[PDB]
Amino acid sequence: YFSSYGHYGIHEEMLKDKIRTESYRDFIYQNPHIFKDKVVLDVGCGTGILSMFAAKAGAKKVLGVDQSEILYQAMDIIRLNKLEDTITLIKGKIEEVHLPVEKVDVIISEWMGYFLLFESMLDSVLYAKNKYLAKGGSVYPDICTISLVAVSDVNKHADRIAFWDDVYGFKMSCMKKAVIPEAVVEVLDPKTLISEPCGIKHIDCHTTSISDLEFSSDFTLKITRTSMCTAIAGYFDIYFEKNCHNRVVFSTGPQSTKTHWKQTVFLLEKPFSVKAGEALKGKVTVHKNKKDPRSLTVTLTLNNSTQTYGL
Amino acid sequence: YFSSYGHYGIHEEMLKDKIRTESYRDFIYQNPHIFKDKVVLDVGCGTGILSMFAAKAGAKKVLGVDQSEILYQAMDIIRLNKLEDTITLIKGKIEEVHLPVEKVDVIISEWMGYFLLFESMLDSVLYAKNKYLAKGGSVYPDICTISLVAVSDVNKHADRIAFWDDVYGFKMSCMKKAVIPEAVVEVLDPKTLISEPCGIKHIDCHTTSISDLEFSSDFTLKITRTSMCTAIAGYFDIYFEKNCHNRVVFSTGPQSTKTHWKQTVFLLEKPFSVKAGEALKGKVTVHKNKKDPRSLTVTLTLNNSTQTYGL
Ligand SMILES: Nc1ncnc2c1ncn2[C@@H]1O[C@H](CSCCNC(=O)Nc2ccccc2)[C@@H](O)[C@H]1O
Ligand SMILES: Nc1ncnc2c1ncn2[C@@H]1O[C@H](CSCCNC(=O)Nc2ccccc2)[C@@H](O)[C@H]1O
Numbered sequence: 001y002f003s004s005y006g007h008y009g010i011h012e013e014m015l016k017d018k019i020r021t022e023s024y025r026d027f028i029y030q031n032p033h034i035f036k037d038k039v040v041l042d043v044g045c046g047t048g049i050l051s052m053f054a055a056k057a058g059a060k061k062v063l064g065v066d067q068s069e070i071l072y073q074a075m076d077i078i079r080l081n082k083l084e085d086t087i088t089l090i091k092g093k094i095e096e097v098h099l100p101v102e103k104v105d106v107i108i109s110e111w112m113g114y115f116l117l118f119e120s121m122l123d124s125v126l127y128a129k130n131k132y133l134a135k136g137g138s139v140y141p142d143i144c145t146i147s148l149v150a151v152s153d154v155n156k157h158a159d160r161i162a163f164w165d166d167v168y169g170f171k172m173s174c175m176k177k178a179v180i181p182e183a184v185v186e187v188l189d190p191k192t193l194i195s196e197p198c199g200i201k202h203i204d205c206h207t208t209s210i211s212d213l214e215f216s217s218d219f220t221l222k223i224t225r226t227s228m229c230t231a232i233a234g235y236f237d238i239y240f241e242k243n244c245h246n247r248v249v250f251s252t253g254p255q256s257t258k259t260h261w262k263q264t265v266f267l268l269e270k271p272f273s274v275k276a277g278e279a280l281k282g283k284v285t286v287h288k289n290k291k292d293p294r295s296l297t298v299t300l301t302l303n304n305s306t307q308t309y310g311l
Numbered sequence: 312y313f314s315s316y317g318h319y320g321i322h323e324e325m326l327k328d329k330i331r332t333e334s335y336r337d338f339i340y341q342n343p344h345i346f347k348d349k350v351v352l353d354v355g356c357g358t359g360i361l362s363m364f365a366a367k368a369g370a371k372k373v374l375g376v377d378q379s380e381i382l383y384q385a386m387d388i389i390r391l392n393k394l395e396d397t398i399t400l401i402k403g404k405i406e407e408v409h410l411p412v413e414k415v416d417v418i419i420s421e422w423m424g425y426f427l428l429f430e431s432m433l434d435s436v437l438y439a440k441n442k443y444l445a446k447g448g449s450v451y452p453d454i455c456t457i458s459l460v461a462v463s464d465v466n467k468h469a470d471r472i473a474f475w476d477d478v479y480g481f482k483m484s485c486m487k488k489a490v491i492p493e494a495v496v497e498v499l500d501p502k503t504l505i506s507e508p509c510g511i512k513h514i515d516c517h518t519t520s521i522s523d524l525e526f527s528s529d530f531t532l533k534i535t536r537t538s539m540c541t542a543i544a545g546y547f548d549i550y551f552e553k554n555c556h557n558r559v560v561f562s563t564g565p566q567s568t569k570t571h572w573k574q575t576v577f578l579l580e581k582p583f584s585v586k587a588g589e590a591l592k593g594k595v596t597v598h599k600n601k602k603d604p605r606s607l608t609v610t611l612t613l614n615n616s617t618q619t620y621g622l
Contacts, residue, residue, distance in 0.1 A: 008489045015478055021479065049483075077485060168360060170360060170363050174387040175358070
């Protein structure tokens with residue numbers, strides 16, 4: 001849970017994601033008017049680097065909150081950089097902790113999971129917004145989108161599914177039923193994309209509620225190559241827009257530099273032929289799992305069949 | 312625990328490890344005299360492929376035992392290959408389950424973890440041997456070794472340790488103390504090896520006891536390149552020897568084809584210069600962690616400093 005985030009390993013991976021970390025750095029350093037003399041809340045501050053960016057940009061006060069043990073490392077790091085007079089770190093869940101202020105001017109966080117919403121803390125960020133954001137205050141990143149794109153990769157498909165038909169001369173076909181419903185997080189070869197992307201979800205963190213994060217979308221994939229469609233890929237775009245002189249965007253899609261989010265891939269049980277110029281129609285719904293509500297399920301209808309996928 | 316092994320993902324990885332899986336296949340198919348008309352116990356049978364190898368080689372009966380939910384998939388797989396009359400699958404811990412026989416002729420398993428002994432079930436295999444192996448019976452694989460080799464990789468070292476000194480202009484040096492004591496599982500470039508390997512441990516599964524698996528060894532690394540020594544790497548070799556006409560060996564060392572075990576790397580807090588022809592002397596001790604006894608610690612003394620490492 002918060003246990004995983006107690007270990008340095010995930011923090012190292014996020015910090016070495018240059019697209020991710022340089023986007024936040026650029027947003028703050030190139031829009032210091034958003035931070036100068038402001039009270040900033042960093043929801044899930046981790047190692048504290050985002051809090052230190054906000055302090056450097058002239059924040060009056062930064063409150064860094066994390067439930068994980070990493071906050072004790074943040075505490076030493078803030079002291080090592082001599083920022084303890086500007087940055088106050090608080091251990092606990094943003095849902096329960098006591099803040100030395102009633103309201104904040106700005107909320108910043110990196111809450112995004114695989115396919116944007118997996119094991120994401122947007123729900124925790126929205127709690128902080130509704131309870132703590134001042135009237136006329138701002139939350140960043142402010143705008144997110146989710147997109148789908150069609151994939152043709154018969155070899156990758158055969159590696160994951162057809163593999164189980166003959167394993168050292170033995171049939172293991174009954175394994176396919178456990179494999180198909182698990183989404184795969186992997187970097188896609190952009191040469192395997194056979195459609196234009198379709199946006200299925202737009203979120204503004206200023207106006208969205210937790211109930212908006214379970215959604216359905218009809219979609220149309222404009223096919224660009226006559227091929228066997230073997231999978232649908234998902235990815236997301238992150239925007240820093242509100243009150244920016246220097247807007248910042250990053251994509252986690254396969255046409256962009258890879259990030260630690262990679263892409264999320266939903267393998268089709270039955271690949272099917274498509275033709276260039278075809279308008280491929282489908283439906284996708286995202287639900288919070290009843291068991292672990294940090295677990296998503298994604299229901300995909302395409303080519304007259306429906307499959308539910310989890311991460 | 313057994314929970315991780317309930318999921319197909321780890322079984323797919325082990326089965327697609329050709330060095331691992333073709334070694335077991337070759338051992339059984341090229342030494343069928345070991346199996347013909349024998350009663351075979353497969354300790355931790357997983358998906359059941361090893362049990363099916365033993366049946367194909369003419370086993371009278373194969374008992375496949377696994378604590379994990381994967382055993383239910385094994386049950387369908389054995390039925391799909393029409394081997395249910397030869398292979399009996401039993402769900403539970405080999406330590407507690409009831410077997411329809413008092414003794415077995417042969418025990419087979421794949422128990423090996425990172426650095427041979429991490430989260431390894433050799434203890435469970437030895438329980439099965441001491442309780443169930445007939446007089447004059449055989450256990451496979453029968454012989455294992457662990458080796459160390461010296462590494463020079465200043466860039467990899469700087470990527471993992473020196474990285475934390477300056478992260479986007481902020482000091483994060485206090486992170487180094489969490490990083491140094493974690494062993495890294497990774498495939499090494501064989502060009503970075505700067506010593507001959509040194510064997511630190513020989514196990515014969517016929518004669519070894521659980522108490523032998525906590526051990527100390529003095530070692531000498533024959534340096535082959537004047538360089539900065541940045542790490543010590545560990546790996547292991549697996550032998551099928553007893554009563555074989557066709558002996559089988561595989562190595563998980565960096566001079567051999569990569570396996571899912573890769574190599575285990577112990578980064579040095581203070582890299583130090585070595586000269587070609589130098590006899591580098593050290594000491595290594597392996598202990599079962601007091602907290603999780605599936606967790607090892609490795610204490611390494613080299614160049615007049617000592618560090619304890621965990622996985
Ligand atoms: N309800 C919750 N209340 C309190 N903490 C919670 C809650 N839910 C989750 N968490 C924590 O949120 C973190 C998400 S991972 C981001 C670490 N922070 C960064 O890298 N930031 C950064 C660095 C550079 C650039 C941009 C950002 C974990 O540490 C969780 O322990
Ligand atoms: N005390 C215990 N009692 C019962 N089961 C236990 C115990 N400790 C651990 N386990 C299980 O042992 C497995 C180790 S992973 C190997 C799967 N088997 C293979 O791939 N075999 C194979 C395939 C091809 C070639 C060679 C071998 C897991 O499924 C655990 O659930």
